[PDB]
Design a protein around this ligand. Structure first.
Ligand SMILES: Nc1ncnc2c1ncn2[C@@H]1O[C@H](COP(=O)(O)OP(=O)(O)O)[C@@H](O)[C@H]1O
Lengths: 628, 271
DNA sequence: ATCGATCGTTTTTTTTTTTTT
DNA sequence: CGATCGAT
C-alpha cells in the first residue's frame, strides 16, 4: 500500500509531540485535550511544523493529499488513543494554515489536485445548510446486515454483494439512520479576486463547499484562504461533451453512463481576514497579564485605574483623539458621550428603555464637520457610515422587487437597519426627501418599526444614535430670520435632538494662520502630528470596560434633578415671547442618561451631583445656543 | 419485560399519584375533562414529569416515538376500562408535551439533532389546504377474488406477505376505495421572524408537518411555539451523486402552541 | 449453470394580461 | 435496452 509512509510519518509526528513539541509544550494536545470531552474532531495543524520535524513532507503532502487525507484521520485516531481509553467515534476535520503560497483563479489545470493552497475572493449569493447521512447499513435481506463498512462514497450505491452468506447481491436490506455515520456541509459561490482585477474576461467564479466547523461563518464581503483540494467531481450528466467515450469491455472467453465530468472546488481552511475585531478579553498589543472579572476585560487595570482616576484625563482624552484637528472644545467632549454608554438599568416589563442619545452637527461650510466623522467609520466597531443618498430608500428599506426569484416580493433589510449597536451616520440632512425623514421621525425614538405592501410581519428596530450634517439656507448665518426660517424645518425633531452644538465660522487672521500652524505638523513627515496623553489601545479598552458596571442614581441631585430641572423650566418659563421655543421631557431623559454617562466616565457606579450640574450647564449651553 | 413493562406502570402510578393543585390532581381528572369535550389531545407536563420521576428524560431520545406510543396506550387502557361508555366515537388517543426549557431559533439545528426531542419557533407562510392520507393497508384478491386482508403497516414501507385467504396465494391483486382507514392532513412552511434575523441578509426556512388532529389552527403569519421533532426523508435520491446528497429536513409536530392564542385559554387553579 | 426467448420501454413548450408603486 | 424466466 502506498501511504504507509504517511502513516508512520504522522505516527512519529505524534510520538514526538507526544513528548514536547515546542519548548516542553505542545500546541496540538490541549486543543485535543479540550476536544476529549465533547469529541468534536477539528484540529488545525501548522504546515510549517511538517518542515520543522518531518523534514519536507510538504512535497510528500501537497500533491497526493486527497488520497493521503483519509490516512490523517486514522493518524488522528491513533493520536487520541495513546492516552485516552478510546473508541473509534473519533474523526478528522482540519482547518489548515501556516501555508505560504497564494494562487488565484487562473492557474487551473489537471495538475493542480491534492494540494492545500490558500486562496481568497468574494462571497456572493450564499446558500443554506443541507445535511447528509452519507452512511448507513445495507446488504442482503435475511439476517446478515451489520454494515458500518466503507459505503460513504459520493457516488452512492445501495447495491452490495454479500458479507457472510451466498445471498442476494442486488436485493438490499433496508436503511439505517440511527447508529451510523453522518455529517453536514453547505454550498456557496465566489467571484474573482478584487486584489486581482484585470481586463477583458469575466469574474470567473468557483464552486465551494465547507465542512462542519467551517459553517455559517462565511458571509458576503469577505476574503479567505482555502485548501487546494481541487476535485474529480462525481457528476452524473451533462451536455456538449462529445469527446471519445470508453468503458471496460471485459475478457471474451468461449452499467453504461455517459462520461463528461465538470469542475468545482472544495476547501478545508478559512481565515476570514479583514473581518475580525475581538472585544476586550482578547490580549491586544498593549496588555497587562493580570487577574480580573474576566481574562483581559480590564486586566490592564494596572493603568486603566489611572486612566479612570485623574481629574485631568477628561481634558486629556478630549485631546487624545483630535491631534490632527482643532476647533471648539465642546463637541470634542460631548461627541464621545454618543460613543460612551448611557443608562443600562435593570428594571421592569414596562417597555424598552433606551441607552443612546441623539447627536447633531451644524456649521458653516468648510469647517471639517465631515472629517470629524470620515474617520469614525475607521474608528468604532459595528458603526460603519455612508450617506443616505449614497443609496436609495433601499438604504432604510431593501431594494423593492417585483419579479419572481424566490417568492416575488422581498424587502427584509436595509442600510440604516443593519447598524446594531453601532452608528451609521449620514450627511446632508436638509435636502433629502421626506420619506426616510418621516421614517426616522419615529425610528429613532420608538425603535420598533413596521412597513406594509410586502410585510413578513414587519417588525424591525433601530439600535443606535446619529450624527447630523445641517447647513443654513444662504450658506451663511446671516441673522436676518428666525432659526425656524433659517433652516426651514420642523419642531419635534428639533426637540427630539437634545444636543445641537453648532459650529460657526468667522474671519480672524490668527485663527487661520494657527490652522496652517497645525499644518506645520501635518507634512513634517517625521512629526507631522501633535503630542498626546493616552494611546488608542488603552483608550478603547477602557471604553470597552466602562460599560459593564450597572450605573445608578441615588443622589440628592437625583432627588433634586427636580430642582435643576425646575430651574431649567424656570429660566425656560419664557422662551415664548421673542421667537417661542418648546421644552419637553425628552430633554429630561437625555439629561438623565447624559449625567449617567458622565459618571460612567468615572469607571464608577452611582451618580454624583457634579454630573447633574455639568449636564445642566451643557443643556443650558445647547438651549441658549439655540437662541437667535 | 420486568423493567420494560414498568413504563406504562410509571404512567399509571403517575397520573393518579403525583398530585398537586392542593389535591385532586389534574391527570386524575384532566383526562376526564379531555374525554368530556371530545378532544383526544391530552397534554403532559415535563416539569411535573421530572418532579415525579426524572428517569424519563434519557429514556426518551433513544426513541421518543416509542415513548409517546407507550404513553397513549396507557391512556386507552385507562379510559375505555373506566369509560367503556367512550368506546363508540373515536376511541383513539395521543398525548402532548408543553415544557421544554429551550428555544432553538432556526439556523441552529444540525445533524446531531436527528430524530429526537425538539423545540423551535418561526412564522407561518403559505402552505397547502386540507387533505387526508391513508392509515391502513388492505387490498383485494382477484385470482381467487378474495381480500388480501388487512396488513400491518410500516411508516413508508411495503409488506406483501404470502398469507391470505386465497390459499395464501394471489401475488397479484387490486385495491378498493373503502373499508380502509383515513387521516386528515395539512402542511406548513415556516419562516423566521424579522426581528431575530442575522441583521440584514436573506432568511432561512424548513418545512413542517402537522397531522390529522392538527389542522385549521394555523394561518399565514401567525405566532407559534412547537416542540416538533427532527425528521429525515431517508433518501432524496442516493445514487452516483451530485457533489452533495439531495437530502432535506422537516419537523413533525407533536404539540403546537400558539403564542397569540386569542381564545378563552387558561386552566383553573383549584381556589 | 448456462443460454436464449420472455417480459416491458417513450418525451416537448415561451410568452401575454392585469397589477402595484 | 433492460430484467424476468424457462429449460438444457
Ligand atoms: N480644525 C481643522 N482641522 C483639520 N482640518 C480642517 C480644520 N478646519 C478646516 N479643515 C479643513 O477644511 C475642510 C472642510 O471641508 P468640509 O467642511 O468637509 O466641506 P463641507 O463644508 O462641504 O463639509 C476639510 O478638508 C478640512 O481638512
Amino acid at each position: 500500500v502506498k501511504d504507509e509512509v504517511g502513516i508512520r510519518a504522522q505516527k512519529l509526528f505524534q510520538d514526538f509531540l507526544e513528548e514536547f513539541k515546542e519548548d516542553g509544550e505542545i500546541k496540538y494536545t490541549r486543543p485535543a485535550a479540550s476536544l476529549e470531552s465533547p469529541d468534536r474532531c477539528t484540529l488545525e495543524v501548522s504546515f510549517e511544523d511538517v518542515e520543522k520535524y518531518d523534514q519536507n513532507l510538504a512535497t510528500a503532502i501537497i500533491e497526493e493529499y486527497y488520497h493521503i487525507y483519509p490516512f490523517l484521520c486514522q493518524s488522528v485516531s491513533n493520536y487520541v488513543k495513546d492516552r485516552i481509553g478510546l473508541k473509534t467515534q473519533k474523526d478528522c476535520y482540519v482547518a489548515f494554515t501556516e501555508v505560504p503560497t497564494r494562487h488565484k483563479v487562473r492557474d487551473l489545470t489537471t495538475s493542480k489536485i491534492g494540494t492545500l493552497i490558500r486562496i481568497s475572493g468574494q462571497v456572493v449569493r450564499t446558500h443554506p445548510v443541507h445535511p447528509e447521512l452519507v452512511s448507513g447499513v445495507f446488504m442482503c435481506l435475511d439476517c446478515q446486515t451489520e454494515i458500518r463498512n466503507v459505503e460513504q462514497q459520493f457516488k452512492f450505491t445501495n447495491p452490495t454483494i454479500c458479507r457472510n452468506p451466498v445471498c442476494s447481491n442486488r436485493k438490499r436490506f433496508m436503511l439505517d439512520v440511527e447508529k451510523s455515520l453522518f455529517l453536514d456541509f453547505q454550498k456557496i459561490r465566489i467571484q474573482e479576486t478584487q486584489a486581482e482585477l484585470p481586463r477583458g474576461c469575466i469574474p470567473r467564479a468557483v464552486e465551494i463547499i465547507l465542512r462542519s466547523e467551517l459553517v455559517e461563518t462565511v458571509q458576503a464581503g469577505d476574503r479567505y484562504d482555502f485548501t487546494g483540494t481541487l476535485i474529480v467531481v462525481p457528476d452524473v450528466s451533462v451536455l456538449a461533451g462529445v469527446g471519445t467515450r470508453a468503458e471496460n469491455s471485459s475478457r471474451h472467453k468461449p452499467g453504461m453512463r455517459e462520461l463528461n465530468y465538470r469542475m468545482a472546488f472544495l476547501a478545508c481552511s478559512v481565515q476570514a481576514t479583514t473581518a475580525r475585531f475581538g472585544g476586550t478579553d482578547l490580549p491586544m498589543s498593549e496588555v497587562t497579564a493580570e487577574d480580573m472579572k474576566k481574562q483581559m476585560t480590564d486586566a490592564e487595570w494596572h493603568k486603566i485605574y489611572e486612566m479612570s482616576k485623574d481629574r485631568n484625563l477628561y481634558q486629556n482624552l478630549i485631546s487624545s483623539l483630535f491631534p490632527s484637528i482643532y476647533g471648539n472644545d465642546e463637541v470634542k467632549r460631548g461627541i464621545l458621550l454618543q460613543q460612551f454608554g448611557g443608562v443600562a438599568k435593570t428594571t421592569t416589563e414596562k417597555t424598552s428603555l433606551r441607552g443612546d442619545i441623539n447627536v447633531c452637527i451644524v456649521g458653516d461650510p468648510s469647517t471639517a464637520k465631515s472629517q470629524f466623522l470620515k474617520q469614525v467609520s475607521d474608528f468604532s466597531p459595528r458603526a460603519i457610515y455612508t450617506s443616505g443618498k449614497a443609496s436609495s430608500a433601499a438604504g432604510l428599506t431593501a431594494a423593492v422587487v417585483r419579479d419572481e426569484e424566490s417568492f416575488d416580493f422581498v424587502i427584509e433589510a436595509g442600510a440604516l437597519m443593519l447598524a446594531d449597536n453601532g452608528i451609521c451616520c449620514i450627511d446632508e440632512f436638509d435636502k433629502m426627501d421626506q420619506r426616510d425623514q418621516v421614517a426616522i421621525h419615529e425610528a429613532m425614538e420608538q425603535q420598533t418599526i413596521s412597513i406594509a405592501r410586502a410585510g413578513v410581519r414587519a417588525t424591525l428596530n433601530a439600535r443606535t444614535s446619529i450624527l447630523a450634517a445641517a447647513n443654513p439656507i444662504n450658506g451663511r448665518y446671516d441673522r436676518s430670520k428666525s432659526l425656524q426660517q433659517n433652516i426651514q424645518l420642523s419642531a419635534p425633531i428639533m426637540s427630539r435632538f437634545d444636543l445641537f452644538f453648532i459650529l460657526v465660522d468667522e474671519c480672524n487672521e490668527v485663527v487661520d494662520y494657527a490652522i496652517a500652524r497645525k499644518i506645520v505638523d501635518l507634512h513634517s513627515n517625521i512629526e507631522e502630528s501633535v503630542e498626546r496623553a493616552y494611546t488608542r489601545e488603552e483608550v478603547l479598552r477602557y471604553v470597552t470596560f466602562a460599560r459593564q458596571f450597572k450605573p445608578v442614581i441615588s443622589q440628592e441631585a437625583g432627588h433634586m434633578l427636580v430642582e435643576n430641572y425646575g430651574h431649567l423650566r424656570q429660566r425656560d418659563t419664557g422662551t415664548s415671547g421673542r421667537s417661542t421655543w418648546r421644552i419637553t421631557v425628552r430633554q429630561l431623559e437625555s439629561m438623565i442618561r447624559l449625567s449617567e454617562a458622565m459618571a460612567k466616565l468615572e469607571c464608577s457606579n452611582r451618580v454624583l451631583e457634579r454630573h447633574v450640574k455639568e449636564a445642566f450647564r451643557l443643556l443650558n449651553k445647547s438651549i441658549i445656543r439655540v437662541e437667535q | 419485560l420486568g423493567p420494560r413493562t414498568e413504563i406504562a406502570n410509571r404512567f399509571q402510578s403517575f397520573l393518579r399519584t403525583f398530585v398537586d393543585e392542593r389535591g385532586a390532581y389534574t391527570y386524575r381528572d384532566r383526562i376526564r375533562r379531555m374525554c368530556e369535550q371530545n378532544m383526544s389531545s391530552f397534554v403532559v407536563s415535563y416539569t411535573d414529569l421530572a418532579n415525579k420521576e426524572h428517569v424519563l428524560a434519557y429514556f426518551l431520545p433513544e426513541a421518543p416515538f416509542q415513548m409517546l406510543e407507550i404513553f397513549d396506550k396507557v391512556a386507552k387502557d385507562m379510559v375505555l376500562s373506566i369509560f367503556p361508555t367512550y368506546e363508540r366515537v373515536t376511541t383513539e388517543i395521543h398525548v402532548r408535551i408543553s415544557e421544554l426549557p429551550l428555544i432553538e431559533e432556526l439556523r441552529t439545528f444540525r445533524k446531531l439533532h436527528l430524530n429526537q426531542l425538539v423545540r423551535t419557533l418561526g412564522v407561518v407562510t403559505a402552505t397547502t389546504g386540507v387533505l387526508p392520507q391513508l392509515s391502513v393497508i388492505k387490498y383485494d384478491c382477484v385470482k381467487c377474488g378474495y381480500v388480501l386482508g388487512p396488513f400491518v403497516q410500516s411508516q413508508n414501507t411495503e409488506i406483501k406477505p404470502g398469507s391470505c385467504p386465497e390459499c395464501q396465494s394471489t401475488g397479484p391483486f387490486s385495491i378498493n376505495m373503502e373499508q380502509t382507514l383515513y387521516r386528515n392532513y395539512q402542511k406548513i412552511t415556516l419562516q423566521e421572524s424579522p426581528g431575530r434575523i442575522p441583521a440584514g441578509r436573506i432568511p432561512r426556512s424548513k418545512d413542517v408537518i402537522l397531522l390529522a388532529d392538527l389542522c385549521d389552527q394555523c394561518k399565514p403569519g401567525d405566532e407559534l411555539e412547537v416542540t416538533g421533532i427532527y425528521t429525515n426523508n431517508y433518501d432524496g435520491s442516493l445514487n452516483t451523486d451530485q457533489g452533495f446528497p439531495v437530502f432535506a429536513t422537516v419537523i413533525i409536530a407533536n404539540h403546537v402552541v400558539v403564542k397569540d392564542s386569542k381564545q378563552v385559554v387558561q386552566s383553573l387553579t383549584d381556589e
